[PDB]
Structures are given as structure tokens and as C-alpha cells.
Motif scaffolding. Structure first.
Motif, mmCIF file in Angstrom:
data_model
loop_
_atom_site.group_PDB
_atom_site.id
_atom_site.type_symbol
_atom_site.label_atom_id
_atom_site.label_comp_id
_atom_site.label_asym_id
_atom_site.label_seq_id
_atom_site.Cartn_x
_atom_site.Cartn_y
_atom_site.Cartn_z
ATOM 1 N N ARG A 80 -23.542 41.378 23.733
ATOM 2 C CA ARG A 80 -22.300 41.426 23.122
ATOM 3 C C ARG A 80 -22.681 42.017 21.741
ATOM 4 O O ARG A 80 -23.333 41.577 20.929
ATOM 5 C CB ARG A 80 -21.986 39.730 22.702
ATOM 6 N N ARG B 274 -26.081 40.710 20.089
ATOM 7 C CA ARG B 274 -26.466 39.419 20.672
ATOM 8 C C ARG B 274 -26.640 39.430 22.309
ATOM 9 O O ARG B 274 -25.866 40.353 22.891
ATOM 10 C CB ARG B 274 -25.495 38.502 20.168
ATOM 11 N N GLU C 39 -16.761 32.884 27.111
ATOM 12 C CA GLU C 39 -15.996 33.765 26.277
ATOM 13 C C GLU C 39 -16.411 35.343 26.870
ATOM 14 O O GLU C 39 -15.464 36.159 26.804
ATOM 15 C CB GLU C 39 -16.845 33.933 24.864
ATOM 16 N N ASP D 226 -13.599 37.825 28.189
ATOM 17 C CA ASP D 226 -13.632 39.385 27.823
ATOM 18 C C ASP D 226 -13.563 40.207 28.813
ATOM 19 O O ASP D 226 -12.507 40.989 28.893
ATOM 20 C CB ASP D 226 -14.995 39.654 26.997
ATOM 21 N N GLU E 127 -12.006 39.536 32.061
ATOM 22 C CA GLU E 127 -10.786 39.165 32.322
ATOM 23 C C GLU E 127 -9.496 39.983 31.734
ATOM 24 O O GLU E 127 -8.861 40.603 32.448
ATOM 25 C CB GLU E 127 -10.361 37.567 32.417
ATOM 26 N N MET E 128 -9.678 39.956 30.222
ATOM 27 C CA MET E 128 -8.964 40.813 29.564
ATOM 28 C C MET E 128 -8.938 42.248 29.696
ATOM 29 O O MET E 128 -8.171 43.097 29.711
ATOM 30 C CB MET E 128 -9.078 40.249 28.128
ATOM 31 N N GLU E 129 -10.277 42.776 29.755
ATOM 32 C CA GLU E 129 -10.724 44.112 29.949
ATOM 33 C C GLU E 129 -10.010 44.672 31.022
ATOM 34 O O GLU E 129 -9.653 45.667 30.995
ATOM 35 C CB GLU E 129 -12.345 44.099 30.243
ATOM 36 N N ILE F 284 -15.743 45.115 23.352
ATOM 37 C CA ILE F 284 -16.011 44.075 24.543
ATOM 38 C C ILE F 284 -17.188 44.887 25.359
ATOM 39 O O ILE F 284 -18.119 44.057 25.460
ATOM 40 C CB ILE F 284 -14.925 43.980 25.638
ATOM 41 N N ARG G 90 -11.290 43.408 21.468
ATOM 42 C CA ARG G 90 -10.747 42.190 21.366
ATOM 43 C C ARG G 90 -10.520 41.786 19.760
ATOM 44 O O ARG G 90 -11.388 42.033 18.915
ATOM 45 C CB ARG G 90 -11.492 41.095 21.960
ATOM 46 N N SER H 44 -7.194 34.304 19.332
ATOM 47 C CA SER H 44 -8.273 35.033 19.748
ATOM 48 C C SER H 44 -7.802 35.965 21.245
ATOM 49 O O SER H 44 -8.993 36.812 21.316
ATOM 50 C CB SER H 44 -9.630 34.451 20.099
ATOM 51 N N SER H 45 -6.795 35.952 21.486
ATOM 52 C CA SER H 45 -6.537 36.288 22.986
ATOM 53 C C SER H 45 -5.607 37.715 22.387
ATOM 54 O O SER H 45 -4.982 38.338 23.497
ATOM 55 C CB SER H 45 -6.055 35.710 23.727
ATOM 56 N N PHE H 46 -6.054 38.446 21.572
ATOM 57 C CA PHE H 46 -5.380 39.866 21.449
ATOM 58 C C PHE H 46 -6.448 40.829 21.845
ATOM 59 O O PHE H 46 -7.548 40.966 21.445
ATOM 60 C CB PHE H 46 -5.030 39.941 19.879
ATOM 61 N N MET H 47 -5.644 41.877 22.595
ATOM 62 C CA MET H 47 -6.458 42.783 22.974
ATOM 63 C C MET H 47 -5.864 44.385 22.597
ATOM 64 O O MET H 47 -4.605 44.306 22.560
ATOM 65 C CB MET H 47 -6.685 42.916 24.408
ATOM 66 N N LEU I 16 -2.197 35.048 32.747
ATOM 67 C CA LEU I 16 -3.238 35.417 33.823
ATOM 68 C C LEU I 16 -3.101 34.566 34.798
ATOM 69 O O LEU I 16 -2.878 33.258 34.596
ATOM 70 C CB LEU I 16 -4.578 35.678 33.334
ATOM 71 N N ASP J 153 -5.411 32.628 36.054
ATOM 72 C CA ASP J 153 -6.021 31.411 35.644
ATOM 73 C C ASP J 153 -5.173 30.502 34.360
ATOM 74 O O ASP J 153 -5.994 29.417 34.002
ATOM 75 C CB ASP J 153 -7.396 31.580 35.304
ATOM 76 N N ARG K 277 -4.667 31.556 31.221
ATOM 77 C CA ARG K 277 -4.880 32.161 29.640
ATOM 78 C C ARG K 277 -3.713 33.208 29.449
ATOM 79 O O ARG K 277 -3.339 33.941 30.334
ATOM 80 C CB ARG K 277 -6.446 32.746 29.899
ATOM 81 N N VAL L 24 -2.673 36.408 27.255
ATOM 82 C CA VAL L 24 -3.263 37.375 26.552
ATOM 83 C C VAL L 24 -2.297 38.335 25.913
ATOM 84 O O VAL L 24 -0.918 38.440 26.657
ATOM 85 C CB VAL L 24 -4.077 38.413 27.664
ATOM 86 N N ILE M 265 -1.392 42.209 24.385
ATOM 87 C CA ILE M 265 -1.869 43.395 24.408
ATOM 88 C C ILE M 265 -0.930 43.995 23.200
ATOM 89 O O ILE M 265 0.329 44.218 23.242
ATOM 90 C CB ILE M 265 -1.753 43.991 25.577
ATOM 91 N N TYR N 127 -13.839 30.367 20.065
ATOM 92 C CA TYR N 127 -14.091 31.765 19.745
ATOM 93 C C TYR N 127 -14.378 31.800 18.081
ATOM 94 O O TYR N 127 -15.316 32.486 17.791
ATOM 95 C CB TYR N 127 -12.751 32.574 19.992
ATOM 96 N N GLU O 99 -17.829 30.539 17.941
ATOM 97 C CA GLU O 99 -18.875 31.590 18.525
ATOM 98 C C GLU O 99 -18.852 32.620 17.630
ATOM 99 O O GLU O 99 -20.120 33.187 17.722
ATOM 100 C CB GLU O 99 -18.403 31.937 19.984
#
Lengths: 140, 136
Positions: free
Chosen positions: A31, A43, A128, A132, A134-136, B33, B41, B52-55, B85, B87, B89, B91, B93, B123, B126
Motif C-alpha cells: 500500500r 506499508r 480496504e 481498492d 473492486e473500485m479499480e 491504489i 482513491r 472514502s469511496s471517491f475514485m 456495486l 456487493d 458498496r 462508488v 467516480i 478508512y 486506517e
């Protein structure tokens, strides 16, 4: 082969703070951390074949290994010198100061075995990282 | 200063899927990423919430490499899309945006926004851990 890794190194590092064990670990995921305008830090989610642990960070002098792709997901590393620290919020982290890459990612090819997170901090990292990816993946 | 951001835009996006607004948001954290073509991200703030779910769309990557889009800068989003998505979540963009004020012009995080949802709270925790690990 799981047997070529240092089984139990993650538990020994985390519960006893062993630093002399020169552990042989697989890199599962890297990461990059980019704070402000600063150069990246890395990391690492690392595996000893039994567990993964996400609280590893590369010392800055090892950054070129990641940039050169010498140190990449699925490579196997022998750590030579590392230090354990407890952060001010109680989290236990491991700073990798010197290491050697024993096998490149392409030689190993893939994750060794099926290691499981050592703690909730590591499962949060895994979540996390899964997020990442999945978004990718925009294209299917 | 929080009133200078589009307070409530994150809730509007997440609940109503409103992509017709042109919200003004602050970047709190940017992270690539992959470690390949970079993909960013973002943890964004509207003054009330962080999300935190902006890409970033690949075509906006030059703003990051030029260090124009950077932590604490304030942006206006001109085109974006929000999807759930499989699942569950959601997102967002970011397709088109303008940096209105540089990180240095703004100078600090604006206000004390809270995470919109549990995913963002994790997020932030972390990412605060990431930062603590660096400063060692």
C-alpha cells in the motif's frame, strides 16, 4: 512452498517482540502512502505462511526496491534487521530496515498457501485492499 | 469556512444519486491504489461529512502528478457518476473537476467533518494509522 517461510514469525514478533529471527516472509500486498506533497512510503501486508500481518512499513532506504519492482506482491524476502514499535494509540508496527529479496514475484507466481489475518487490524487492511481492487476494476 | 464547502453534497450523492450538482469539496487524503497506470482513491469532505469511496478517472491523473490535486486543496466537481456495486458498496467516480484553491492557499483541513458511513470511518482510522506509521 509454505515450508520455506518462517512459520510463526508473525506471532513471535507480535506477542514477544522477537527481532533477531531474520524472518522469511512473502509480500502479499503493498500500500503506497502519499501524505501531502511528500514522497511515498510503503506499508506491507506480509505472510509467514500461517498468518498475514499488515503493520509492516519499509524504511525509506528500501523504497527503491518497490519502485524497481524488485519488491512486489508475491515476492519472498528475508528480513535482516527490523524494529518493533508500539505507536501512541497502542498499535504494534514493524519497521523493515534491511532485507534481501530471495525470490521475485514471477518466480513464486502467486500467494503461498492460505494465510489468515493475525488480528482485526489486518482484517481491516484486507477489507480496504479488497475495496481498492473492486473500485479499480472498471472494465470486465 | 465549512460553509464554503457544499455541505450536504455527500448525503445528496449517496442517498439520491444526484449527479446534477456541482459540489465544492476538500480533498482530505489521496492515495494511489496500485504499486501499472496509477489509480487514485480519495477521501473527500463536504464540510459536514467525509466519504472514502471517491475514485479519480484516469484522465484526471495529471492533476495529481502535477501536485495540483493534493491533500487540503478545494475542488469543484464538474462531472461525476455514482454507482452501487453488486456487493452494495457505492462508488463515486470523478470525471471532470477544477482545483479552485491549492492545498497551500487553503492551508489546513476545513472544520471537523465526520465519516458518512462505517466504511469511511474504518478508512479514516486506517489512514490515520498509515500516517502514524510514517512519522516514526
Amino acid at each position: 512452498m509454505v515450508g520455506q517461510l518462517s512459520e510463526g514469525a508473525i506471532a513471535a514478533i507480535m506477542q514477544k517482540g522477537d527481532t533477531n529471527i531474520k524472518p522469511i516472509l512473502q509480500v502479499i500486498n503493498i500500500r503506497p502512502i502519499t501524505t501531502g506533497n511528500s514522497p511515498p512510503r510503503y506499508r506491507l501486508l506480509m505472510s509467514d505462511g500461517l498468518n498475514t500481518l499488515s503493520s509492516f512499513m519499509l524504511a525509506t532506504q528500501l523504497n527503491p526496491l518497490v519502485e524497481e519492482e524488485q519488491l512486489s506482491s508475491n515476492c519472498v524476502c528475508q528480513i535482516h534487521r527490523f524494529i518493533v514499535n508500539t505507536l501512541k494509540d497502542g498499535r504494534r508496527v514493524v519497521i523493515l530496515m534491511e532485507l534481501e529479496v530471495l525470490k521475485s514475484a514471477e518466480a513464486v507466481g502467486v500467494k503461498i498457501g492460505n494465510p489468515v489475518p493475525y488480528n482485526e487490524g489486518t482484517s481491516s487492511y484486507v477489507i480496504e485492499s479488497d475495496e481498492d481492487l473492486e473500485m479499480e476494476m472498471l472494465k470486465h
